[PDB]
From Swiss-Prot, chain B:
Principal location: endoplasmic reticulum
UniProt function note: A cytochrome P450 monooxygenase involved in the metabolism of sterols, steroid hormones, retinoids and fatty acids. Mechanistically, uses molecular oxygen inserting one oxygen atom into a substrate, and reducing the second into a water molecule, with two electrons provided by NADPH via cytochrome P450 reductase (NADPH--hemoprotein reductase). Catalyzes the hydroxylation of carbon-hydrogen bonds.
Protein name per its UniProtKB record: Cytochrome P450 3A4
Keyword Ligase: no
The gene coding this protein: CYP3A4
Quaternary structure note: Interacts with PGRMC1; the interaction requires PGRMC1 homodimerization.
Subcellular compartments: Endoplasmic reticulum membrane; Microsome membrane
Record note on what altering T324M does: In allele CYP3A4*11; unstable form
Length: 441, 457
């Protein structure tokens, strides 16, 4: 099954037996995609064990997979197991169950519901300033991932459940941990046949206590909102309701806080960009005025900085869809069962599409130059019917933190500040050493 | 009284007459009056359209402050235009929160993805444009460019915004074009558009008489045309976005037609007028026309069909379109109503004053452009484009209330110029007005229509 890309004429690295090309992941997913982007051109294929993966970079071919042929062919992502009761998660659901959950959780982040969350986040935006002021008046570098993690936890636990927590961050911080050095997930890539061995016999990849604590915490949350929508629509099951809460809690904590740490690093390493951003926030909101829903979307340089950070640090790295039947798109034959992959990290730094892609230049997303950006090359939230469902929720929650903090504090690098920031050469997109900076009031 | 405002503020300007103000100086038109004031009074001057004081600014920082920085807070709305009737809900006429809702609603109409989807549709009518140009070319005979460009522009804006192929082969007496033409006629000689400026108190009187600046013949026709243009069920164009957003709430039936008439008028008149000015400059400069044709053939050899990416690759084509818009900014002026007392760049502006940006005069300012009356596309080359201020050259405006169909118009015009210059070259005639005299009336148009010979290659 390792002569597939040799048959279809698609170039790619030579695979090893059983392993395939997973030994090239020693530098990470990002470095392997960028080296293959230069060696084999626009389209190449490799093997994650015995699973063939076709990598595409053509925007028209990307649009056909993500948007056009979504509901028809490229509907589901790579099979991820064994998950146990987490098989009902919207991000892991497949075919008919996904559409029922996508439509059920779509009214969660409308313009009406997002406008209701502004006063709720406005409460947590004050404790963030008061806690940073304790570390500001005292010469002491702040681990931004910590203080932003608590801010990211209170927002998703209140805007989705109405419960104020002020053990969840400890249990949530230990939900993923996708380390390729761990032979377990390196085995699932090599042994896709061991997934049915653990599904019929009830074995999961997530630790029991991070799933038992959340299944019992959601039951305490069930005091008869995003939770209010899942009860009024309840045919939704009770155990299925827990699986969706784990997805929202983890995304609202890990994704928003890690990107916020990426933003503050770029602002501290580029003073003229942070200073120009502070002058704009003081103009739209003078005297440290509380931000509203309209003043957030009005700040465009705030949008030009966030969109530039998401280009440099796409926490997704890759988008994946599984070909469910024999098709031919843009004059290329993709057989059934092939995982079509779109290297987001490699495309966000393609010299063919970006000038000086290494350097932090928010001028790429200016309304004068944003017309030169392909929407299928810059996909930090994906695209099509199966993109990020909390895209507008994440872009709002991160900007609300950037407004309220830059109105009161200014960030400078420290001695222990890793410059340049080296990304984690492992699995998920994170810095090697934690992001630490000095806070000046 | 009010005619002493600029005397009180120390701002120079022509001495106004009672009641009339300075409107008698419009005998040469908006453009000539603005350039003469810019030479005598300097960077800032003020005049009166009757009793309405108009402050003209030419400073790029002051222009950026009005158009970009202080749009949502102070300079949000244009000068009130009436009587308009139900067309007050149009995006270009809407004010304050109504415009802000409509702007965000119609913004996804012209994205890079939506525009790239329109190229195959525009490519269809590009082939029809070449066929009609080839009949008038196979036989020595002038060719009124405004007519053949007007039929092409109506074909593009109706199909890309509504999905309806209305003009088929022509139909040279097409009812859409015939009804949309009489939709714009600001003849300052007509007392109507001159008296309502002298008597602004008559606008609320005319609004209660159901009197509009648009004739009932063209509004009732377009009212039932858009209603019959709703066909379903069976894409996602301009019409589909308005129905999906129709289902705070919401978009009315009379509001959906108001925006459609705006998109129909802009896509027809503006695109066809600039194309006529472009071809006049190419015929009167055969060297520029040859260099542009050599670039189209280099990017699209063997008459290759134009695509979204090949259009953006042609630099000289972008330089020809930009230089023509510099000489002929169909906007002429940009205006914003100052809604509250402000002090920008060290100058006080009181509430109610209309801040005006003389775009026509700024595009021909000798202290910004070398030989401003000469047609030189080399100003917009990448070697010289850094010496161009984006607040002196504003053919599509600037800020949150600039031209919402800028990127569409730049594509529809370039897609037409490519497929036309691929097959034809244009030369002047005996009846071609050389030099071109602009209409001394209101809107920016030529005196005698642009007529040229069409030779095949
Ligand atoms: C900076 C913040 C975030 C980024 C960059 C991000 C990125 C992404 C990407 C790239 C995808 C997949 C798109 C595709 O496959 O085409 C995705 C899916 C998803 N995201 Fe996010 N995300 C963020 C925050 C959030 C938040 C706050 C939530 C809150 C619920 C969330 C919930 C989800 C879910 C449920 C899915 C799967 C939807 C489905 O499979 O149908 N994400 N995200
Ligand atoms: C060569 C072609 C065109 C030129 C030179 C042009 C120029 C302009 C200018 C200068 C403005 C005012 C900007 C400001 O006040 O700051 C404007 C506004 C506008 N234009 Fe265009 N335009 C063109 C074609 C089009 C097209 C094809 C459409 C299609 C819908 C369109 C729709 C509009 C609308 C709706 C506005 C008002 C926007 C608002 O009030 O928010 N225009 N145009
Ligand atoms: C795992 C691989 C990449 C081989 O196969 C997939 O593709 N399995 C997708 C589903 S595992 C995941 C389950 C999980 C993990 C850890 C804690 C809790 C649940 C999942 O539910 N995650 C989406 C929900 C939250 C989120 C995260 C980031 C951004 N927004 C929202 C993985 C997947 C889902 C969605 C977007 C992705 C982008 C890049 C890479 C993988 C993606
Ligand atoms: C009327 C004056 C100039 C004193 O006061 C304004 O300012 N009234 C603005 C709104 S009248 C117009 C209504 C109309 C007229 C004729 C047919 C159909 C509708 C309008 O809706 N037109 C914008 C939409 C179309 C368009 C036109 C040209 C370019 N692109 C798009 C006038 C106005 C609007 C937008 C840009 C302008 C530039 C220069 C001068 C005036 C402008």
């Amino acid at each position: 099954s390792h002569g597939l890309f040799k048959k279809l004429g698609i170039p790619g690295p030579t695979p090893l037996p059983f392993l395939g090309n997973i030994l090239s992941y020693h530098k990470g997913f990002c470095m392997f995609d960028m080296e293959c982007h230069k060696k084999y051109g626009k389209v190449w294929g490799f093997y994650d064990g015995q699973q063939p993966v076709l990598a595409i970079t053509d925007p028209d071919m990307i649009k056909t997979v993500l948007v056009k042929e979504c509901y028809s062919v490229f509907t589901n992502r790579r099979p991820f197991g064994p998950v146990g009761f987490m098989k009902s998660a919207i991000s892991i659901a497949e075919d008919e169950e996904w559409k029922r959950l996508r439509s059920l959780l779509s009214p969660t982040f409308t313009s009406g519901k997002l406008k209701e969350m502004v006063p709720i986040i406005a409460q947590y935006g004050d404790v963030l300033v008061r806690n940073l002021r304790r570390e500001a008046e005292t010469g002491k570098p702040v681990t931004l991932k910590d203080v932003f993690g608590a801010y990211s936890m209170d927002v998703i636990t209140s805007t989705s459940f109405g419960v104020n927590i002020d053990p969840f961050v400890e249990n949530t911080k230990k939900l993923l941990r996708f380390d390729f050095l761990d032979p377990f997930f390196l085995s699932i890539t090599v042994f896709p046949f061991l997934i049915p061995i653990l599904e019929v016999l009830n074995i999961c990849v997530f630790p029991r206590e991070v799933t038992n604590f959340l299944r019992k915490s959601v039951k305490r949350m069930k005091e008869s909102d995003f939770l209010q929508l899942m009860i009024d629509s309840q045919a939704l099951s009770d155990l299925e309701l827990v699986a969706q809460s784990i997805i929202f809690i983890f995304a609202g904590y890990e994704t928003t806080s890690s990107v916020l740490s990426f933003i503050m690093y770029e602002l501290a390493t580029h003073p003229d960009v942070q200073q120009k951003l502070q002058e704009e926030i003081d103009a739209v909101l003078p005297n440290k005025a509380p931000p509203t829903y309209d003043t957030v979307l009005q700040m465009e340089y705030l949008d030009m900085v966030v969109n530039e950070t998401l280009r440099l640090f796409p926490i997704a790295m890759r988008l994946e869809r599984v070909c469910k039947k024999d098709v031919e798109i843009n004059g290329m034959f993709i057989p059934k069962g092939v995982v079509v992959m779109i290297p987001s990290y490699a495309l966000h730094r393609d010299p063919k599409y970006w000038t000086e892609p290494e350097k932090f230049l928010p001028e790429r997303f200016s309304a004068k130059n944003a017309d030169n950006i392909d929407p299928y090359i810059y996909t930090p939230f994906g695209s099509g019917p199966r993109n990020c469902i909390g895209m507008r929720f994440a872009l709002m929650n991160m900007k609300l933190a950037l407004i309220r903090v830059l109105q009161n504090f200014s960030f400078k690098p420290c001695k222990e500040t890793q410059i340049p920031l080296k990304l984690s050469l492992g699995g998920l997109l994170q810095p090697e050493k934690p992001v630490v900076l000095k806070v000046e009031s």
